[PDB]
Amino acid sequence: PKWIQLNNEIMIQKDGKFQFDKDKEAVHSYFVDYINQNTVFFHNLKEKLDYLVENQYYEEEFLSLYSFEDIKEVFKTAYAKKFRFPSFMSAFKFYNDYALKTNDKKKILERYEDRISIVALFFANGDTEKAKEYVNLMINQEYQPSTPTFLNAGRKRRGELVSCFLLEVNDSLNDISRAIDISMQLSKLGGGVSLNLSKLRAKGEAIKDVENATKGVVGVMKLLDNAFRYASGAAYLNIFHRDINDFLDTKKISADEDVRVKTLSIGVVIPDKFVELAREDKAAYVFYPHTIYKEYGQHMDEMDMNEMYDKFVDNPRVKKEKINPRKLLEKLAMLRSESGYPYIMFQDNVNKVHANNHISKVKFSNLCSEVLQASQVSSYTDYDEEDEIGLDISCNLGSLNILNVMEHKSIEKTVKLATDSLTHVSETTDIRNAPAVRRANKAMKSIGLGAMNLHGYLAQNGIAYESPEARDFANTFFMMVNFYSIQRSAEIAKEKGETFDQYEGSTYATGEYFDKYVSTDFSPKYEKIANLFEGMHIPTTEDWKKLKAFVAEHGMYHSYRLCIAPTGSISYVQSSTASVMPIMERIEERTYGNSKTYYPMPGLASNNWFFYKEAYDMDMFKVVDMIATIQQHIDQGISFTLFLKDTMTTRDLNRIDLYAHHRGIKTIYYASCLSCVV
Amino acid sequence: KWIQLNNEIMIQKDGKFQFDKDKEAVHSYFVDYINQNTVFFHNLKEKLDYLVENQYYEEEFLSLYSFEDIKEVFKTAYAKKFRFPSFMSAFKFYNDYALKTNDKKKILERYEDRISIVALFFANGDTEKAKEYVNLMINQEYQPSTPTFLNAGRKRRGELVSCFLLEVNDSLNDISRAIDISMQLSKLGGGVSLNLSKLRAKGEAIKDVENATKGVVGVMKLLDNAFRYADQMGQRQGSGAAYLNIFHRDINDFLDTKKISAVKTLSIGVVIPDKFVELAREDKAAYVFYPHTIYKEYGQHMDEMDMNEMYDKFVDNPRVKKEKINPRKLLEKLAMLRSESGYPYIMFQDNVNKVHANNHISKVKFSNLCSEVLQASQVSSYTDYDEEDEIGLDISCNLGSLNILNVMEHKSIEKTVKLATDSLTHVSETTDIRNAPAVRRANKAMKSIGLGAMNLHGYLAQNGIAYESPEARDFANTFFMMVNFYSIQRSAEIAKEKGETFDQYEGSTYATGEYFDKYVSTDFSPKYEKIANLFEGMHIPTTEDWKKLKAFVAEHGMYHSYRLCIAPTGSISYVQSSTASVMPIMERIEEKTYYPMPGLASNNWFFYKEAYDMDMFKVVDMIATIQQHIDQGISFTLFLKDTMTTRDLNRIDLYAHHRGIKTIYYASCLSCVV
Numbered sequence A: 001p002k003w004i005q006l007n008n009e010i011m012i013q014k015d016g017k018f019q020f021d022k023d024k025e026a027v028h029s030y031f032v033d034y035i036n037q038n039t040v041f042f043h044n045l046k047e048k049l050d051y052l053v054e055n056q057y058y059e060e061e062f063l064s065l066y067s068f069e070d071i072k073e074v075f076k077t078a079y080a081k082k083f084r085f086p087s088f089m090s091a092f093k094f095y096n097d098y099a100l101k102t103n104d105k106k107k108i109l110e111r112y113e114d115r116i117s118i119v120a121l122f123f124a125n126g127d128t129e130k131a132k133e134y135v136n137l138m139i140n141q142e143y144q145p146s147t148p149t150f151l152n153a154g155r156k157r158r159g160e161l162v163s164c165f166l167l168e169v170n171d172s173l174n175d176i177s178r179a180i181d182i183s184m185q186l187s188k189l190g191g192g193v194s195l196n197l198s199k200l201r202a203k204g205e206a207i208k209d210v211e212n213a214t215k216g217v218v219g220v221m222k223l224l225d226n227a228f229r230y231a232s233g234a235a236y237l238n239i240f241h242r243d244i245n246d247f248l249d250t251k252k253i254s255a256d257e258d259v260r261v262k263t264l265s266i267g268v269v270i271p272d273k274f275v276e277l278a279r280e281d282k283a284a285y286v287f288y289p290h291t292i293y294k295e296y297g298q299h300m301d302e303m304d305m306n307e308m309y310d311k312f313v314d315n316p317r318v319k320k321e322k323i324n325p326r327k328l329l330e331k332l333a334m335l336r337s338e339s340g341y342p343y344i345m346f347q348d349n350v351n352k353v354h355a356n357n358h359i360s361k362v363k364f365s366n367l368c369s370e371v372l373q374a375s376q377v378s379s380y381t382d383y384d385e386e387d388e389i390g391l392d393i394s395c396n397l398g399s400l401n402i403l404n405v406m407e408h409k410s411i412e413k414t415v416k417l418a419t420d421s422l423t424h425v426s427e428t429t430d431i432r433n434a435p436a437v438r439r440a441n442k443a444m445k446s447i448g449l450g451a452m453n454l455h456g457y458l459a460q461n462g463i464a465y466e467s468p469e470a471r472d473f474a475n476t477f478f479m480m481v482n483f484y485s486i487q488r489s490a491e492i493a494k495e496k497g498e499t500f501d502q503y504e505g506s507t508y509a510t511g512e513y514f515d516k517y518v519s520t521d522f523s524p525k526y527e528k529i530a531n532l533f534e535g536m537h538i539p540t541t542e543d544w545k546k547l548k549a550f551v552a553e554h555g556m557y558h559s560y561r562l563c564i565a566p567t568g569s570i571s572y573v574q575s576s577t578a579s580v581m582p583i584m585e586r587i588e589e590r591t592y593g594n595s596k597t598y599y600p601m602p603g604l605a606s607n608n609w610f611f612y613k614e615a616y617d618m619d620m621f622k623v624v625d626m627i628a629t630i631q632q633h634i635d636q637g638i639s640f641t642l643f644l645k646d647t648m649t650t651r652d653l654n655r656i657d658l659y660a661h662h663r664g665i666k667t668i669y670y671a672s673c674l675s676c677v678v
Numbered sequence B: 001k002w003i004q005l006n007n008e009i010m011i012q013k014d015g016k017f018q019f020d021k022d023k024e025a026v027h028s029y030f031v032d033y034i035n036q037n038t039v040f041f042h043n044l045k046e047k048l049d050y051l052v053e054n055q056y057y058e059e060e061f062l063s064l065y066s067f068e069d070i071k072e073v074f075k076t077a078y079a080k081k082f083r084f085p086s087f088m089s090a091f092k093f094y095n096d097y098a099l100k101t102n103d104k105k106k107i108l109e110r111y112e113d114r115i116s117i118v119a120l121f122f123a124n125g126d127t128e129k130a131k132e133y134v135n136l137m138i139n140q141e142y143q144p145s146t147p148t149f150l151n152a153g154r155k156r157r158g159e160l161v162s163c164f165l166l167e168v169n170d171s172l173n174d175i176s177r178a179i180d181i182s183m184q185l186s187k188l189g190g191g192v193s194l195n196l197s198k199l200r201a202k203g204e205a206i207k208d209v210e211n212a213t214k215g216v217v218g219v220m221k222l223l224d225n226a227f228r229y230a231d232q233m234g235q236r237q238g239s240g241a242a243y244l245n246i247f248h249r250d251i252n253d254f255l256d257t258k259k260i261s262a263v264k265t266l267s268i269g270v271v272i273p274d275k276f277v278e279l280a281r282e283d284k285a286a287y288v289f290y291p292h293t294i295y296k297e298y299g300q301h302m303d304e305m306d307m308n309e310m311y312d313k314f315v316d317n318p319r320v321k322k323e324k325i326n327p328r329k330l331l332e333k334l335a336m337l338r339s340e341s342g343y344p345y346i347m348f349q350d351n352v353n354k355v356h357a358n359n360h361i362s363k364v365k366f367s368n369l370c371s372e373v374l375q376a377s378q379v380s381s382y383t384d385y386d387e388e389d390e391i392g393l394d395i396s397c398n399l400g401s402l403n404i405l406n407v408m409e410h411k412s413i414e415k416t417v418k419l420a421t422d423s424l425t426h427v428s429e430t431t432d433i434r435n436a437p438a439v440r441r442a443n444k445a446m447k448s449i450g451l452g453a454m455n456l457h458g459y460l461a462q463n464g465i466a467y468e469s470p471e472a473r474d475f476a477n478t479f480f481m482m483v484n485f486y487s488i489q490r491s492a493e494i495a496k497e498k499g500e501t502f503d504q505y506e507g508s509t510y511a512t513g514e515y516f517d518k519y520v521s522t523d524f525s526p527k528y529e530k531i532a533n534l535f536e537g538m539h540i541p542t543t544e545d546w547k548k549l550k551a552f553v554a555e556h557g558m559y560h561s562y563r564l565c566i567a568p569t570g571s572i573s574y575v576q577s578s579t580a581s582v583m584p585i586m587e588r589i590e591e592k593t594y595y596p597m598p599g600l601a602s603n604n605w606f607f608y609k610e611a612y613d614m615d616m617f618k619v620v621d622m623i624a625t626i627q628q629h630i631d632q633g634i635s636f637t638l639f640l641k642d643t644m645t646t647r648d649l650n651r652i653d654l655y656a657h658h659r660g661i662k663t664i665y666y667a668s669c670l671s672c673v674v
């Protein structure tokens, strides 16, 4: 092939440097000589849209809200910008993973600008003017909806626009069977399911009269394992659950094969009491949760372990087991070193700053440890009896492109317009066969707006990832994202005239959420960073006082608004570095069918090679500082992968773990998440 | 000590075994042990109050009787000084049935106590019927099934039925529900058999996407883990079964999950209609079908259509997808797999439905864990969460067996079957199982019971009759004809007493009269004079009697959709001092504890011929002769010698099929035995 030959000329050194400028000709040799030759061209858009509608690719019910004169302008608004892919891989990933091919998969029916216009039309819901705003937002590459939303919007044979779910499992056979079903019902829809197993009683607990008969959390994982294989799942366990060790032992590569679940990623929920016990090397006790329920009438998973730990240890009716917390903490380091996960969640770093503890304290997370929301377990009763439908969690995700948002000075416009997009995706998803998910989506209206291209933007403006100026930039940037996200949530609250259920008891309504912003200023401390926000207003401490009073009068429409998820193949389309993380490689080498493909990180030039420092060469404690400073202005979580070298002892890894907990990190794991990325 | 007396049976003296030494061993078991470990009470009231106050017995059923009556019923049980004739007969009762204390260190319940509580539970307040129930069980004329006999009248009660049959529809919603129902029933200690014949095969379409289904095998693996999770909370009872019609495309992959060199704890059954046998006999190629392509074409499930009428049409319809296989190879494959695993249970579907009375409800499509219950069923449709489901008809097995020997000793064929039918009817009306809607609906609508029999070989050998003789079949033909006669009569008597009939009875062959064509034209009085003399003092119904019963049923209807089925007899066969079910005995003495067959002496040693020495073709003749008068099925285990080729095994299958055998397999079923 020809376009491959031009891309590989990057590695052919000329004058002592790589031929980065050879990728522009490789992507040019890709649009010519292939994809332009394989687009079944139409004479007019009307001929184009009618074929796509008559032959049943696009849904008809949403084009029916627009007059055709408007649809042509929206499509004209997309091509109006002469958009050119800067890299070969950036166009390769779109026209192979996103563009709509024909049913016989031999012709390209959709190009960029087509996907964007259809998506924009779907978002606007009939508003021709907003559909053009959505086009410009995505064609300037300021905002990028998640893969399930970007790919499946407006199509027939629709995959759900949500592809990430969190379930609560109650402690009964009835609830386990339902959780098995809901997992398959959601898995077939292309979504990832993460289940909290901490309310299930441990191995060797009682079943009514018989005293030693429960198979524990492990047995339910084997049921869930087969269920996901039939139709990527995850299971979180609180670290004080007795089965925590057997929970971790199903993921050793050397597992007994008869107990090894193979399609379940695992997560571990750790409250502060465990960190304190590990720090002082004294013996710790894990508990049989049903003895807690039998005694206190409440789920151990719903009580404050920081207040109840000593009481459980001293209650003789509570059954306990002695463990070594340092050995268990080192063990979490090895399994993460061996599988990337268990995803670690510092439970009290989430709820210290949680706005909706009146609904519930956050108890677990999703497949990549970014979604952190309240939840209430259901109780699916017998057949003839009514069930109690609680609140599960749905992940409506999307990320801004930090680079292009700064180039266009559109922090307010992009965040507020993206919020409308996520709110529309939430109101259009109506999932059946998963009742607690469905009830929670209409009641909580939670969205997850993220960001990407932090490292690419910093390296393209002469700023190092580990530098104090970088942290100073992120501190101001995400403070503005949080500002306008809250502002848009309150603006939507008055337009619609309602708030998310039980908002009256949130810290948004009581004002506690704004204590930090009305007392502390977040304008950049370095003048070099201040010059980056030229031409756009930095909200002052007086602005936050005004927003707090405005929210106090009209309320919030969303219970949760921001979360920073990983960016899968779409990061290539956006010509962006992955998520808010540092880059792993300056140039990537991938083997796609008898051909070597090279993709230098976006914007990588010979004059910024120093600034594209690879993550494995970085100080992970300084990386923790960066993620902690961003988490200050993210109400949910941030997917954080530690990039570790092989030559690190178990004391070095726990020192990084303990440090992250100290700085207030909510979630962490090392470096399956396909359904739950942007 | 009592073991030393029992083992003295095998110390041969005078050239023979010491069979009368078991009489002394059982005496040495009641003294020096169980009397030393039986909680003595001063009065019956002190006993009954302790058992009720300390929450062993339920109070709500003893509250229907005045204590003067309860004392009389208990007095009626001890009135017959009942003694176990063998050591094992009492050993199995006081270890598997008698109610021990909560700490398992003392025996709170003896025989006559268990019999009376069960009898009191059955009669539901009728003191006089409670005495009839006592006499019936203390004479050992009838024996309720293990789940009914063990758990009756207790607190923290286990279900009186422990055997279920499920239909599975072809959707994810229905598979999830079937997974749940299997676990919901297994935790209750029951065995559940699921019909998988409506599930689409591997490589069929899921809506738009082509070649995307995992087939029945993937559903078997989900059910497999489901039974392993819910094992009755530590009772080692992960007993499930899965049936597949042989014309299902996945039939080969279905059988391959049970090869030792491969899912475990899932028994399999194969439903074979006449068309498949015909194709194999004439060495013609056979076609298996993708069931969903049949559904898309004809709107009906392939499992609900007549393959003998539709086969050629299926083969010719180009919109129906088929696959060619060798039926001769598949029969040999069924022969070896049965020889190595006991199952696949084989069901000759057309031998079941030829004589089925309720084909208007459905043709029988599968069976239970041991191939005895054969009843109509209708698939449910478990829809989405916010939509209402459609509840079809599953199957429940309320089992019980009469003791053929003692029924002949008491000349009580009519009294026992009618009274046992009353007991099984009460079990059906007191079982209200939640988490299994179609099971619950069908039990109230169909009211199907399964009365069996045991001690057929033990009775024949104690009257100088060989199992393989024509006189044995002549006895079996006449005896079970009477069971079927008085069972139908009692079923019609209850229909008139209660004034109602089982749902859609009006369209059964009982109502149209076709059911009685054989009995009103052909006589079933014994042909051999030796056999006729055994029924002295008892009336053998003539063709004129059947005419009267047929007209009586036509006016009052039938209360039970199904009445008779001969299930295996588990550990309770020891308590009844009886040979297992209607099968021949496998060994004269079992092995350390030794148990000689009931009544086995040196003067009838010839008649206690061991089953592996018998001609299985003659055994088929015996089972075919009984099946004439059983409306459901008979659990039939072939007893095969090692020196039998896979071609020898197929000859037995085809013969049994020709002779009208309904179900067959080689030689677990614990939840579905009596």
Ligand SMILES: Cc1cn([C@H]2C[C@H](O)[C@@H](COP(=O)(O)OP(=O)(O)OP(=O)(O)O)O2)c(=O)[nH]c1=O
Binding pocket: A188, A230, A231, B169, B170, B171, B172, B173, B175, B199, B200, B205, B206, B207, B212, B213, B214, B215, B218
């Ligand atoms: C969802 C799913 C179904 N199946 C099987 C199980 C059922 O036997 C069969 C029917 O599934 P259904 O749940 O009925 O699927 P559907 O109703 O969306 O589509 P259709 O119009 O074809 O009915 O497909 C799988 O094998 N894997 C799967 O992931």
Ligand SMILES: Cc1cn([C@H]2C[C@H](O)[C@@H](COP(=O)(O)OP(=O)(O)OP(=O)(O)O)O2)c(=O)[nH]c1=O
Binding pocket: A171, A172, A173, A174, A176, A200, A201, A206, A207, A208, A213, A214, A215, A216, B187, B229, B230, B231, B232, B233
């Ligand atoms: C039925 C059953 C349950 N379990 C486990 C799953 C659940 O986590 C736990 C609770 O089962 P449950 O369905 O709640 O049992 P129960 O309600 O009859 O009794 P209890 O009053 O104790 O709730 O037991 C098994 O491990 N094996 C089994 O067979």
Ligand SMILES: Nc1ncnc2c1ncn2[C@@H]1O[C@H](COP(=O)(O)OP(=O)(O)O)[C@@H](O)[C@H]1O
Binding pocket: A027, A028, A031, A032, A036, A083, A084, A085, A086
């Ligand atoms: N970098 C690019 N990104 C996207 N499409 C491109 C690119 N370069 C060329 N094309 C495709 O080729 C067409 C124009 O071809 P070409 O002569 O290479 O470029 P231009 O006319 O912009 O100078 C565009 O309309 C588009 O379909």
Ligand SMILES: Nc1ncnc2c1ncn2[C@@H]1O[C@H](COP(=O)(O)OP(=O)(O)O)[C@@H](O)[C@H]1O
Binding pocket: B026, B027, B030, B031, B035, B082, B083, B084, B085
């Ligand atoms: N074979 C047996 N079957 C049943 N009960 C027996 C048997 N042997 C002994 N018993 C029990 O042990 C008690 C003691 O028996 P024993 O005194 O020898 O005979 P009996 O009471 O008939 O004169 C009996 O009353 C009975 O409760």
Ligand SMILES: [Mg+2]
Binding pocket: A171, A172
């Ligand atoms: Mg419970």
Ligand SMILES: [Mg+2]
Binding pocket: B170, B171, B172
């Ligand atoms: Mg369907």
